Design a protein around this ligand. Structure first.
Ligand SMILES: c1cc(CNc2cc3c(cn2)[nH]c2ccccc23)cc(Oc2ccc3c(c2)OCO3)c1
Ligand SMILES: Nc1nc2c(ncn2[C@@H]2O[C@H](COP(=O)(O)OP(=O)(O)O)[C@@H](O)[C@H]2O)c(=O)[nH]1
Ligand SMILES: [Mg+2]
Lengths: 427, 59
């Protein structure tokens, strides 16, 4: 059951390359695409993400997209650049100017059909494709505007395939330009319709984590992306390694998403670790469980205690007692059952994988479908309205053909989404 | 995208038209300004003809 991976834009390609770097190591694939591991467990599901080529060489089923060449040139000269199939580098030259309109309507439109040719070519070589995944930001123009155009066109050509995303939500604390609330609001509308799972990475939670917990005084985007790739590896562990039970993306989505529009998840990771800084003391199951449920370990800057969990998935990695896991997981729910909806019975599920990640004997990944995520969308809406009530910076968009009405529309849909979350918070 | 093309075209168009009538109106005004100056100098010539002429009508 193959997955096709797509990464779009500055942020999308930088976190995306880290993903392939991290899991390529987990599967014993070197920067040449050659396997040099010890176990057979790390090749049993390798077809999920890698195509097998001549010479017993493994090639990521990855398509790399940008409207400017700078970041993708840096990928090929990068730590694992050689592994990617060179025909899958699809890029323009003009850039998107941190402008959703350019990525979605004018510059991206020019380029999108070329991208879809590669998607189709990678799909037709799939025995049974089980879905697509995208990495991208919502604050820029390529990943935000063109990424959501791709998603719309993928759903047109593959309407029954699962589509999941890691979407970096913008924040003023870690910010490139002032129009990010505009691009994020326009993108969220598209995600609400055309994705099955969206893992919301709020770039300020990554910042607070890097500063307040890893004691990094001036974190870079690189430090921020180490946390993201840890989560990306964690949430895909049970598809990449033989384990307790195997569910395809559809079955996983069915049991996590009770309502089609409420598919924006809160990811988290324990233990939280910085690059290089070596961790020597392994965590106990109680420590992993407290930390992965703690607000400080969440990567969407939302207090889980301000909402209620609709569903929760937790993925523990390493050698540990699944009995101790069961008891500790059941202890968290039974101790804070007022933050779980009583009308979805047994809505906290768990999986264990014996293969730990690089550098940790033991880790846990948290996937929370909480109504508290509305706080993230309330933040974007406030920032959106603060400029939009004065029509500020809109000339960048009206000059690409957009009307004020599309912004009003985008604003209203996200205020609906916020109110939808509030309905189930009080039920 | 069609609206954006239409808007880049109308701006190019109206700029071409606004400039062309400016350069014409400026051509008209400057000519009507130099001609008026010349014609005062030519009324000047007749007058001087009438002064030399009147003096001959004096003997
Ligand atoms: C594929 C699978 C998943 C995991 N989805 C999931 C898991 C479980 C679940 C419901 N859903 N319920 C569970 C109960 C127990 C254990 C696990 C689950 C997420 C995903 O999203 C992305 C998007 C972009 C990326 C990316 C991953 O990696 C690099 O770029 C893609
Ligand atoms: N985590 C992370 N976020 C990024 C990075 N680069 C840009 N961003 C975020 O994405 C937004 C800018 O979008 P951008 O990446 O330029 O979109 P693009 O035009 O598609 O490349 C800003 O709000 C940044 O916070 C990165 O390397 N890591
Ligand atoms: Mg940028």
């Amino acid at each position: 059951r193959e997955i096709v991976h797509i990464q779009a834009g500055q942020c999308g390609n930088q976190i995306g390359a880290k993903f392939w770097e991290v899991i390529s190591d987990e599967h014993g694939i070197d920067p040449t695409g050659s396997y040099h591991g010890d176990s057979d467990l790390q090749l049993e599901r390798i077809n999920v993400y890698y195509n097998e080529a001549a010479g017993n060489k493994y090639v990521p089923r990855a398509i790399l997209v940008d409207l400017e060449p700078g970041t993708m040139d840096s990928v090929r000269s990068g730590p694992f650049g050689q592994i990617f199939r060179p025909d899958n580098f699809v890029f323009g030259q003009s850039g998107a100017g941190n402008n959703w309109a350019k990525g979605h309507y004018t510059e991206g439109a020019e380029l999108v059909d070329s991208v879809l040719d590669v998607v189709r070519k990678e799909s037709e070589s799939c025995d049974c494709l089980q879905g697509f995944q995208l990495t991208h930001s919502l604050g820029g123009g390529t990943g935000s505007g063109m990424g959501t155009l791709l998603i719309s066109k993928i759903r047109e050509e593959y309407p029954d395939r699962i589509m999941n995303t890691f979407s970096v939500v913008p924040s003023p604390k870690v910010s490139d330009t002032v129009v990010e609330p505009y691009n994020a609001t326009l993108s969220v509308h598209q995600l609400v319709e055309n994705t099955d799972e969206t893992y919301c990475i709020d770039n300020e939670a990554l910042y607070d984590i890097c500063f307040r917990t890893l004691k990094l005084t001036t974190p870079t985007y690189g430090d921020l992306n180490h946390l993201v790739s840890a989560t990306m590896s964690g949430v895909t562990t049970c598809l990449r390694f033989p384990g307790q039970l195997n569910a395809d993306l559809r079955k996983l989505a069915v049991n996590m998403v009770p309502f089609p529009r409420l598919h924006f998840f809160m990811p988290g990771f324990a233990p939280l670790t910085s690059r290089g800084s070596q961790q020597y003391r392994a965590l106990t199951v109680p420590e992993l469980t407290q930390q992965m449920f703690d607000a400080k370990n969440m990567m969407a800057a939302c207090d889980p205690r301000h909402g209620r969990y609709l569903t929760v998935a937790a993925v523990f990695r390493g050698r540990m007692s699944m009995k101790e896991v069961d008891e500790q997981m059941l202890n968290v729910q039974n101790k804070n059952s007022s933050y779980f909806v009583e009308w979805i019975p047994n809505n906290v599920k768990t999986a264990v994988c014996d293969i730990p990640p690089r550098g940790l004997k033991m880790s846990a990944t948290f996937i929370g479908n909480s109504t508290a995520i509305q706080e993230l969308f309330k933040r974007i809406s406030e920032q959106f309205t603060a400029m939009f009530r004065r029509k500020a910076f809109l000339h960048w968009y009206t000059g690409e053909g957009m009307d004020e009405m599309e912004f009003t529309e985008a604003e209203s849909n996200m205020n609906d989404l916020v109110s939808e979350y509030q309905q189930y918070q009080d039920a | 995208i069609q609206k954006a093309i239409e808007e880049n075209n109308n701006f190019i168009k109206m700029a071409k038209e606004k400039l062309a009538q400016k350069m014409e109106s400026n051509k008209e005004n400057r000519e009507a300004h130099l001609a008026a100056m010349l014609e005062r100098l030519q009324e000047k010539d007749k007058h001087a003809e009438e002064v030399r002429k009147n003096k001959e009508l004096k003997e």
